[PDB]
Ligand binder design. Structure first.
Ligand SMILES: OC[C@H]1O[C@@H](O[C@@H]2[C@@H](O)[C@H](O)[C@@H](CO)O[C@H]2O)[C@H](O)[C@@H](O)[C@@H]1O
Ligand SMILES: OC[C@H]1O[C@@H](O[C@@H]2[C@@H](O)[C@H](O)[C@@H](CO)O[C@H]2O)[C@H](O)[C@@H](O)[C@@H]1O
Ligand code: NA
Length: 441
């Protein structure tokens, strides 16, 4: 009841800005996250992605970790700023050559590359022209996608267009906690539409530019939502939050248009989604990736910002450094995708947790709660497979401790510990647990 398919993808995941550093090297342009990180007060601990894990130079060390963990895949992102530094403008061949070498190093190690094209590092020049608030950014995103697949698509079969458009749109343009840091609902919703349109345009451009058949998907963060009580007010709140995070993206991707309950709720703040756009958004996916960290147990919050839902913590569930642990939410969300939506196959493209990790006296990192996190979530994946869910792989978040966006370097999600001063990496106990679990397969 333990065993995964022999062809199951086992990996760990990262994002370029979170790990690479070398922010001005080899022609790289300025990204929104460079601008944002360098804006006083935006990052909790004053850190930036300027060095991060120095993976631009140290990716071979990262490959060494993945090999030591007995993984058979690595999910990582390509930095648009390294490929088209102005966003819309000339290619930077040095950037493409870098990722060509990295892809070859992965394939040489027996690690399948699962490449994300957009993991939040929009070139700043595009943001100067409204960024995801402009349709033209979707156009030039698709051009970037074409450029990269033409060069690497002879070797990489598995691509994702976007990582987590809800974060880019709602955290970056509505709540202002992620780059570029805008705070307007209409801007967030407009951004969400142009992200989805970028996705659709990119799929078509990638299929046209591809030198071989590709497996193209999109990666969504999904948060299963539960009403804290069965009162109408709390059930409605759960429904609005579920629409805000999940259905807003799943439905148009599924060819169902935007969810009408949310359209009516947002009113004129929602974009004018003409039919032609929705057709483009609903391009068939070869796979869908799910990023899962937590559930939302919702109570009505009439006085809060839309969607007027607040989290009610449950005393019966333990917390990590930053979240409630709820492994069964992964089962629920997969069963929902399996039964309620058409996408298949599915991958878990990010799942992991943050702890107050410390190097112990013996030199290891004794992260038992993270081991238990993986054990429990993988148990729920076994249950989901048993129910018929077409799950084809699992990527642990993250390969190593990294720059976690607005939290900076101070929130450690790695299965490997990163010393940010020396840049040494050390496998945590949870990493060795994953190694041995995967090898039992
Ligand atoms: O049939 C299974 C595949 O269904 C695709 O979803 C399509 C969607 O692309 C299309 O817009 C609407 C039109 O009604 O139909 C759905 O079935 C998924 O994208 C694939 O992942 C899935 O394999
Ligand atoms: O920096 C830590 C990780 O934060 C996650 O963001 C979660 C998101 O998954 C979830 O859907 C919403 C609402 O429940 O909460 C956010 O905090 C990102 O998905 C990860 O990429 C990121 O590594
Ligand atoms: Na705790």
């Amino acid at each position: 009841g333990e065993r995964f398919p022999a062809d199951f993808v086992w990996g760990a995941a990262t994002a370029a800005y979170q790990i690479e550093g070398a922010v001005r090297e080899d022609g790289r342009g300025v990204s929104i996250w460079d601008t944002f990180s360098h804006t006083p007060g935006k990052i909790a601990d004053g850190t930036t992605g300027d060095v991060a894990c120095d993976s631009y130079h140290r990716y071979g060390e990262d490959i060494g970790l993945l090999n030591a963990l007995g993984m058979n895949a690595y999910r990582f992102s390509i930095a648009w700023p390294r490929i088209v530094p102005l966003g819309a403008g000339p290619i930077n061949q040095a950037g493409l050559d870098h990722y060509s070498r990295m892809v070859d190093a992965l394939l040489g190690a027996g690690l399948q590359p699962f490449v994300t094209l957009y993991h939040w590092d929009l070139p700043q020049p595009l943001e100067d022209r409204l960024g995801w608030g402009s349709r033209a950014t979707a156009t030039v995103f698709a051009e970037y996608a074409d450029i990269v697949v033409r060069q690497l698509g002879d070797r990489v079969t598995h691509w994702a267009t976007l990582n987590e458009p809800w974060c880019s749109a709602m955290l970056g343009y509505y709540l202002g906690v992620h780059a570029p840091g805008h705070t307007d609902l209409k801007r967030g919703l407009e951004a969400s539409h142009n992200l989805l349109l970028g996705h659709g345009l990119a799929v078509q451009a990638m299929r046209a530019a591809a030198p071989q058949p590709l497996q193209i998907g999109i990666v969504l963060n999904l948060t299963p939502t539960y009403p804290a009580s069965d009162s109408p007010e709390d059930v409605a709140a759960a429904r609005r939050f579920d629409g805000f995070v999940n259905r807003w993206f799943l439905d148009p991707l599924a060819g169902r248009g935007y969810p009408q309950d949310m359209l009516d709720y947002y009113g004129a703040a929602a974009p004018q989604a003409n039919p032609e756009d929705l057709t483009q958004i609903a391009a068939p996916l070869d796979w869908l990736g799910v990023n899962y960290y937590e559930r939302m147990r919702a109570v009505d919050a009439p006085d809060a910002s839309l969607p007027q839902a607040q989290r009610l913590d449950d005393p019966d569930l333990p917390h990590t450094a930053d979240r409630e642990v709820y492994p069964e939410g992964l089962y629920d969300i997969l069963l929902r995708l399996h039964n309620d939506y058409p996408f298949r196959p599915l991958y878990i493209t990010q799942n992991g947790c943050a702890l107050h990790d410390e190097i112990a006296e013996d030199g290891g990192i004794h992260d038992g709660q993270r081991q238990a996190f993986f054990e429990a979530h993988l148990a729920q994946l076994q249950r989901a497979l048993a129910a018929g869910v077409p799950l084809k792989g699992y990527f642990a978040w993250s390969l190593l401790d990294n720059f976690e966006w607005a939290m900076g370097l101070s929130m450690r999600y790695g299965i490997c510990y990163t010393n940010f001063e020396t840049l040494e990496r050390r496998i945590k106990d949870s990493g060795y647990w994953l190694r041995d679990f995967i090898a039992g397969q």
